[PDB]
Design an enzyme around this catalytic site. Structure first.
Site, PDB file in Angstrom:
ATOM      1  N   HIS A  53      -1.803  -7.766 -18.513  1.00 46.34           N
ATOM      2  CA  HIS A  53      -0.462  -7.410 -18.468  1.00 46.34           C
ATOM      3  C   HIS A  53      -0.267  -8.406 -19.740  1.00 46.34           C
ATOM      4  O   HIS A  53      -0.886  -9.264 -20.184  1.00 46.34           O
ATOM      5  CB  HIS A  53       0.030  -8.547 -17.273  1.00 46.34           C
ATOM      6  N   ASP A  56      -0.500 -11.914 -19.845  1.00 48.42           N
ATOM      7  CA  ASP A  56      -2.139 -12.471 -19.516  1.00 48.42           C
ATOM      8  C   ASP A  56      -2.620 -12.753 -20.913  1.00 48.42           C
ATOM      9  O   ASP A  56      -3.074 -13.828 -21.117  1.00 48.42           O
ATOM     10  CB  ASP A  56      -2.958 -11.530 -19.234  1.00 48.42           C
ATOM     11  N   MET A  87      -6.622   0.526 -19.929  1.00 48.71           N
ATOM     12  CA  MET A  87      -5.434   0.412 -19.315  1.00 48.71           C
ATOM     13  C   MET A  87      -4.699  -0.803 -19.603  1.00 48.71           C
ATOM     14  O   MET A  87      -5.259  -1.950 -19.687  1.00 48.71           O
ATOM     15  CB  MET A  87      -5.705   0.544 -17.704  1.00 48.71           C
ATOM     16  N   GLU A 180       1.491   1.837  -9.152  1.00 46.84           N
ATOM     17  CA  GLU A 180       0.603   1.403  -7.887  1.00 46.84           C
ATOM     18  C   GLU A 180       1.421   0.782  -6.727  1.00 46.84           C
ATOM     19  O   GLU A 180       2.155  -0.145  -6.955  1.00 46.84           O
ATOM     20  CB  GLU A 180       0.182   0.235  -8.727  1.00 46.84           C
ATOM     21  N   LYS A 182       2.158  -0.600  -2.916  1.00 42.82           N
ATOM     22  CA  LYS A 182       1.789  -1.943  -2.117  1.00 42.82           C
ATOM     23  C   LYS A 182       2.820  -1.804  -0.951  1.00 42.82           C
ATOM     24  O   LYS A 182       4.205  -1.737  -1.377  1.00 42.82           O
ATOM     25  CB  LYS A 182       1.601  -3.333  -3.001  1.00 42.82           C
ATOM     26  N   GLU A 216      -4.874   0.788  -4.758  1.00 49.84           N
ATOM     27  CA  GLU A 216      -5.764  -0.104  -4.524  1.00 49.84           C
ATOM     28  C   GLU A 216      -6.275  -0.198  -3.194  1.00 49.84           C
ATOM     29  O   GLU A 216      -5.387   0.039  -2.210  1.00 49.84           O
ATOM     30  CB  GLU A 216      -4.841  -1.423  -4.908  1.00 49.84           C
ATOM     31  N   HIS A 219      -4.372  -2.637  -0.974  1.00 49.03           N
ATOM     32  CA  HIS A 219      -3.034  -2.360  -0.688  1.00 49.03           C
ATOM     33  C   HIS A 219      -2.856  -1.293   0.558  1.00 49.03           C
ATOM     34  O   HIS A 219      -1.881  -1.398   1.358  1.00 49.03           O
ATOM     35  CB  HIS A 219      -2.190  -1.768  -1.872  1.00 49.03           C
ATOM     36  N   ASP A 244      -7.837   1.184  -8.377  1.00 50.37           N
ATOM     37  CA  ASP A 244      -8.242  -0.382  -8.322  1.00 50.37           C
ATOM     38  C   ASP A 244      -9.101  -0.863  -7.101  1.00 50.37           C
ATOM     39  O   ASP A 244      -8.622  -0.207  -5.809  1.00 50.37           O
ATOM     40  CB  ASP A 244      -6.858  -1.126  -8.310  1.00 50.37           C
ATOM     41  N   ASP A 254      -2.744 -10.077   1.166  1.00 50.55           N
ATOM     42  CA  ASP A 254      -3.669  -9.412   0.101  1.00 50.55           C
ATOM     43  C   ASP A 254      -4.785 -10.351  -0.394  1.00 50.55           C
ATOM     44  O   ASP A 254      -4.753 -11.423  -1.100  1.00 50.55           O
ATOM     45  CB  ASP A 254      -2.869  -8.983  -0.972  1.00 50.55           C
ATOM     46  N   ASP A 256      -8.007  -9.548  -2.156  1.00 52.66           N
ATOM     47  CA  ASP A 256      -8.459  -9.424  -3.331  1.00 52.66           C
ATOM     48  C   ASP A 256     -10.053  -9.939  -3.246  1.00 52.66           C
ATOM     49  O   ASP A 256     -10.235 -10.239  -3.979  1.00 52.66           O
ATOM     50  CB  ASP A 256      -7.584  -9.908  -4.379  1.00 52.66           C
ATOM     51  N   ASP A 286      -9.801  -5.074  -9.172  1.00 50.34           N
ATOM     52  CA  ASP A 286      -8.458  -5.963  -9.428  1.00 50.34           C
ATOM     53  C   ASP A 286      -8.704  -6.925  -8.111  1.00 50.34           C
ATOM     54  O   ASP A 286      -8.661  -6.357  -6.936  1.00 50.34           O
ATOM     55  CB  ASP A 286      -7.076  -5.063  -9.105  1.00 50.34           C
TER      56      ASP A 286
END
Lengths: 387, 387, 387, 387
Positions: A53, A56, A87, A180, A182, A216, A219, A244, A254, A256, A286
Site C-alpha cells: 500500500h 506501507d 501488484m 477486492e 469484503k 480473498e 472475505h 488473495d 477476519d 487472516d 494477505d
C-alpha cells in the site's frame, strides 16, 4: 520437502509479515520491520515478489525527498534479490480522514483527496513494474441505514473508477484494476460485499475491460459462501485478475490465518480449480502471523503458506490423474455436464418427444449420482490414503 | 387500523398460505387448501393477487384434461374476486428427478426435460396475464466439490436462459424473467448465491434486457448481507423486476417468517427504499405460517404481512418528511454524497491544489459525521416516539 | 486399507442409512429400508451396533401385537449378526401432536403423553441392552418471543427429567440419560442450545449423576462454536456419555454430512482428543447420505464415516508420538499449562515479589509462543507430508 | 420525552464513551477523555454510575503515588456528582504480556502475575463501593488446536477463580464475581464461549455461590443465539449478577452499537424479561460510539442507549397490561405451561389412561397454538400501532 521457488509466483504484502500485532483489544507485540529486511527474508524463503500500500512504503506525510529515499532503498533491495512487485494498492482506510470512506465519503473534499492519493500511487506502481492495481474499499459502507444512500454511493464509486480508467488510458499505462470485495469489517456493512456484487458493478463502468476482481478466501467465507464456486464464476467471466490467499474459520471477524489453515477442504478445491483452469497470476498471501508469535514465528507462518499450497497442488494433481477418479467422474456424469443441453436448437427441443411426452421421469429419478464415492476418493487423495 | 386494499399491490404465492407444515423433522400439521379457497380468502384480506408454481396449480402428472379443469376452476375464482396473477414460476425442485438440479443437472436428459417443463408453464403464465416469470434454481448446486464443475454448470445455466429468451422472443410474449438467488438450502451451496452473483450472470446472457432479479429478504440474510443495500444495487442497475418479502432471524435455515418479523430495522430501511425509489411492482410475500398454527393462524399471519408493510410505510414517510430529519441529513452531508466528485473533469482535479497539496486533512478528519443523532431520529420515528 | 471391526465401536442410527431423502423442498428419492436389512448391511461393513428412536422400529400407532413382532424380527437380526444396541431414544418431534414440543409443550396433556411415550421406550431400550438413553428436544423452543416463557419451560423440562430419573431408579435399571443440544432447526430457537447450556441444566436436576450430554459435531458448528473445545469441557466435567459424529459446513441448516466431510481440521482435533482422553463409549454416526444417492451410495457414505475416523486416528497418533512434536509442545509451554499456577497457596502468592513487584513484564511479553510451527507440524501430520 | 434518572440504574464503562476509535484497520479519530470529565458528562445525562478496568483509571505502570492521585481525582468527581461505581474489572487483555491469556496463559509466571494484578484491583473496587467484580477472559483461548489443551486450561481457570474466592472470603469483602462469556474475538475461539458454558463452569468451583454471569447482548448474538432465552436460563439458575447492554447485527465482529440498535425485537423481549423478573442490578452499557462521530456524537450515542431502554420498557409494560394480550396468552396456553405436568406424581401418571391409552392424539394435534396472533399483538405494541 515441498520447497517453493520464484517460479511458483508466491507473493506477500509488506503489511502481512510486517503486521505488529495490534488488534481491537491489544497493543503491538512485535517491533516494526523495515521493508528492506522483509524483502530480503521473503526472497530467502523462495517468494517471487512483494506488494504494498502506498503508506506501507512511504510513511504518511513524507516530504518528496523522504519519499525519494524510501523508494531508492526499496528499489535497491529488489535489485539485490531479484524480487518483483506485481501488484500495488492504496491505503484509503487507516487515516482518520477516511473514517466515512474514500471514494464514497459523504464529504466531497475527501472524495477528491482520495482520488489524488490513489493517482499518485498508480504512477509509483507503474514505475516499479506492477501490472495490477488493487482497490479494497474497506471504509465504503455504513453502520446505520440513513448514513449512506447506496444508489448515490454507487454513482460516486462508478465516478471514481471511471476517472481512474481515464487516467491510465491517458497516460498509456499497461496496468489493470482489481476490486477486492469484503462483506463487513471495519464498517458494519461494506459496499460491493462479495465477488458477485463486484462483478456486477464492473459491467456498469465506462471501460469494463480494464477492471477485474481480487477475491480473498477469508472475505467470501465471512459471508458463509463457497470460495471455489465464487472463483469459478470470476474465471467464467474472465475477470480473475489476482487472488488473495489466507485461512478463516467461518463467519466471525477476519482472522487472516496462514493459507491452508481454516477450511482445509475448501483450500484443496481452490488449488484444484486454479491449477486446472491454468490461472497464471500471482499466488498472493494477505495473512497475519498471529500476535502470539515472535519473528521466528512470522517466518515460519509465511513459509507454511507456500508449503500448504504446494502440498495441495500435488494432491489435487494426483486426484485428477487417477484413472479410478476419471472413471468415477464419468459415473457421476461430469462428462455430460460439459455437453450442450440443446445444440440441436430450440425448435428441435420443442419437437423432441423424448424430452417431455415420452421422457421416463421415474427411471431418470432412480439413477444415483454416485457423488459420495467420488467425494471419498477426493478425501483419500487429500489425506494421502490412496485413491 | 392500517387496512390494505388491492391498490397496495400485495401478492401471495399459493404455496405460502397453502404450506401444510411438513419440515425436515415432522409431518404436515394442516390439510391441503384448494387454490380456489385460497384465492377467495386472500381477496377478503385485501390482497391484490396470487402467484403459483406450475405444480401448485396442476398436480404433477395430470392429463391434459385434468389440467384444463384445474385451470378453468382457478380462472373462475380470479374472475369472481378481481384477483390478478402478476408472476408465475416452475417447480424444478420437488420431484426426485430434479435431485441434482434442473438446468444444471449433470444428466443431459434431465436438463432437456427441465426446459420443456418450464416452457409449458410460460405459455400458461402468459395466458393468465403474468408479467414476470421467476426462476429459483433451488437444486442447482452441490454438497461436495467434485460433483459439479462450476464453469460447465454456468455454461449450462446460460444456455437454458438464452433458450428461454429465444422462446419468448419468438412467440412475441411480453413477459420478463427474474432470477431468484439463494445461498444454500436445499443444496449445500446453490449457484448464483446472492443478488450480486445473479446481476453479474445476467450481463453474460444473449439478451440481458429480458432478465432481472427477484431477491428475497430471508435469502440475503442467510449470507449475513444487508438486504436494503443489495436492493439498492439492484435498483441502481435497473434490475429490480420483482421482490419477495418475509422475515428471517440471522444465518440459519430459511425460516420464512411473516414480513416484519425477523430483522425489524432492516424491514424499515427496505420499505423506506422501495417507497423512495418509487418501485411499482408487486409487494409479494413468500413466507410460511408456522406449523404451530391452525387455519385461523394462517390468515392472521398473512394479514400481518400486509399490516407490517403499511405501518413501516407510514413511519418511513413521517421520517423523510420531518424537517428535523431533513436538517440532520444535511448535517451528515447526505446532500454532498449526491453531488459529483469531479464534474470539473480529470485534468481540473489533477490541477486542483485544494484536492491534495493544500488539503487540510486534519481539519477534514476532525469533522463528526453526526450519524448517531440521525439514527436515533430514525429509531424514534420507527417506534412512534417523536422525531 | 483402514478397515473397521466391531472393536472400533462404530454405531449408526437406523434413521441415518434409512433416510429416504425427503427435505423441506422435495420428495423422497429412496424407498424405505427394513431395519432387518440395515442391521445386516451395517454388520457387513464392520459396524459394532445400531441405535433407534421408538418410531423407527415400531411404526407409530402399532398394536401391542404388531409391536411384539417388530421387536422379535429385530432381535433375530441382532442375534444373527452379533450387532449390539448401545443407545436408544424417543421420537418426540415427528407427529403433529409435538408441534410445540414434548416435555415443554404449552398443553399439559401433551407433556403427560410425551412422558408416557418416553417411559414405554425406556423399558424396551433396557430389554435390548442399551446403556444410554438420549433425549433430543428438537421441538422444545419457539419462533416468537411471547409463545414460551423460558423460566416456566425450564421448570417443565426439569420436572420431566426428574420424573424419568425417578422411574429408572425405582425400576433399578442401569441406564443413564444423555441430553443432546441443538441451537435451532426445526424450531426458530431450541432450549438448551449448546453443550454448555445442557451441562448447566443438568446441575439443577435432582440426581445429576444420572445425566450427561450427547453432543453432535454439526449442532455445535451451527452456532459457530469449536466442537473439540466443547467436548473438552464435557470431558472435564465427567459428562461425555455418548457422542454423535457427522460433518457440517458452517452456520446454515443441519447438513448431516458423513464424518470427515465439513470441517476436516476440527475432525482431526476431535479424534486427537477422544483418543487421548481415552473415551470408551460408542463412536456413533448421526448423518444422512445425500438424497442424490442410490443404495450403493448409502453404503459408500456409511463406510466413509468409519474410514475417515480410522485415518484421522492414525494421523493424530503419529502427531503425538513424533519426538519433534513433543519438543515443539515443550517449546510452546504446553507442559507449563499442566502445572498448577499456585500450589504454594494464596499467601505465598501474595508474598511472592517475583509474581508482581519484580516481575519483568517486557521480558515475558517478548517470548514467542511458537504456535505456528506447532500448527504446521500438525498440518504436515494430517496430510501425511512429514512431521 | 423518556428522560432517565439515577433511579433507572443506568451505568457506563469509562472505556465506552472514552473509546478513541482505533479499530483493526485505523487510527484513533478522537482524543482521550479524562475520566473526571466522563463522570461529569454522564451525570448530566442522567446516568447512575460508571465502571472501570484498572488500566482505564490508572495508566499501566503508574507509581504508587501517581496511582493515589488518579484515585483521589476520580473520588472527588464521584463526590461532586453523586455517581456510584457498582462494578469494576481487570484489563488482562491489552498489554502484550497477556497475548496468550491471563489465567490460562501457557507461561506459569504470567498466570501468577495475572492473579496479582487482579487482586490489587479487587482491593480498589471494594474501596470505591463496587458490589460486582467482572472477569472477561478475552485472551483465554487459541487460534490453533495444539496450542491449548482445554482440560488443562479449565483446571487453570478453576484454580484462578478458586484463589480469588479464597482471597475475598479471607478479607471478609462483600463482593461477588461475574464471568462474562464471549465466543471469539480477539482469540480465534475463547474458552467459556456462551452463558451456558460459564454457568456450567461455575458449578465446579469451590464456592459456587460467589459467582454468577455478566452476559452481553452482542456476545451471545455473535454465536447466533437468542439473548433473552440465555438470560432466562441465567435467571432460572439465580445467576444473573449483572448485564451488559449493546446492539449487534448478527454473526460478525463485535460491533458494540448503542443499545436498541442491532436486533430491535430481541431488545424488546430482553426488556420485557428483565422488567417482569424484577432484575434489580445495574443496566450497564458496554458499547462504542462509532468512530465516525465527534464528542457531540459520543454524548448523543450514550443518551440513545438510555432512551431506547425507556421506550422499550414502556411498550413491554403496555403489552403485558393489555387485556387483549392477557386473553391471547391464555388462548396460546401460557397459563398451562406454568402448571406442573405431574404434581400427581410418577405412579399416578403411569396409571393415568388419559395420558396414553386413551389420549386422543389427533384432537390434541389439531389445536392451533395461536402464536401468530399473539406475536402480531406484540409487534403492534412495540410499534405503538395498537394492541
Amino acid at each position: 520437502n515441498y520447497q517453493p521457488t520464484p517460479e511458483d509466483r508466491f507473493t506477500f504484502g509488506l503489511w502481512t509479515v510486517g503486521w505488529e500485532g495490534r488488534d481491537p483489544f491489544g497493543d503491538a507485540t512485535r517491533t516494526a520491520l523495515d521493508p528492506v529486511e522483509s524483502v530480503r527474508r521473503l526472497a530467502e524463503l523462495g517468494a517471487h515478489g512483494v506488494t504494498f500500500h502506498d503508506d506501507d512504503l512511504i510513511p504518511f506525510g513524507s516530504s518528496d525527498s523522504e519519499r525519494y529515499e524510501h523508494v531508492k532503498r526499496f528499489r535497491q533491495a529488489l535489485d539485490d534479490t531479484g524480487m518483483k512487485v506485481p501488484m500495488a494498492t492504496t491505503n484509503l482506510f487507516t487515516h482518520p480522514v477516511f473514517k466515512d470512506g474514500g471514494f464514497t465519503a459523504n464529504d466531497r473534499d475527501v472524495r477528491r483527496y482520495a482520488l489524488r492519493k490513489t493517482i499518485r500511487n498508480i504512477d509509483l506502481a507503474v514505475e516499479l513494474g506492477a501490472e495490477t492495481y488493487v482497490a479494497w474499499g474497506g471504509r465504503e459502507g455504513a453502520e446505520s441505514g440513513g448514513a449512506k444512500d447506496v444508489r448515490d454511493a454507487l454513482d460516486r464509486m462508478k465516478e471514481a473508477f471511471d476517472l481512474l480508467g481515464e487516467y491510465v488510458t491517458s497516460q498509456g499505462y499497461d496496468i489493470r484494476f482489481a476490486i477486492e470485495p469484503k462483506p463487513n469489517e471495519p464498517r458494519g456493512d461494506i459496499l460491493l460485499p462479495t465477488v458477485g456484487h463486484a462483478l456486477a458493478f464492473i459491467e456498469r463502468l465506462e471501460r469494463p475491460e480494464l477492471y477485474g476482481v481480487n477475491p480473498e478466501v477469508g472475505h467470501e467465507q465471512m459471508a458463509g459462501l463457497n470460495f471455489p464456486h465464487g472463483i469459478a464464476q470470476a474465471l467464467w467471466a474472465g475477470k480473475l485478475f489476482h487472488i488473495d490467499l489466507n485461512g478463516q474459520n467461518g463467519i466471525k471477524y477476519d482472522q487472516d490465518l496462514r493459507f491452508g489453515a481454516g477450511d482445509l477442504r475448501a483450500a484443496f478445491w481452490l488449488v484444484d480449480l486454479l491449477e486446472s483452469a491454468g490461472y497464471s497470476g500471482p499466488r498472493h498471501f494477505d495473512f497475519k502471523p498471529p500476535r502470539t508469535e515472535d519473528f521466528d514465528g512470522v517466518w515460519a507462518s509465511a513459509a507454511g503458506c507456500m508449503r500448504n499450497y504446494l502440498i495441495l497442488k500435488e494432491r489435487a494433481a494426483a486426484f485428477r490423474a487417477d484413472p479410478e477418479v476419471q472413471e468415477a467422474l464419468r459415473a457421476s456424469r461430469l462428462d455430460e455436464l460439459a455437453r450442450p443441453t440443446a445444440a440441436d436448437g430450440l425448435q428441435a427441443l420443442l419437437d423432441d418427444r423424448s424430452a417431455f411426452e415420452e421422457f421416463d421421469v421415474d427411471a431418470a429419478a432412480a439413477r444415483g449420482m454416485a457423488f459420495e464415492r467420488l467425494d471419498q476418493l477426493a478425501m483419500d487423495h487429500l489425506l494421502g490414503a490412496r485413491g
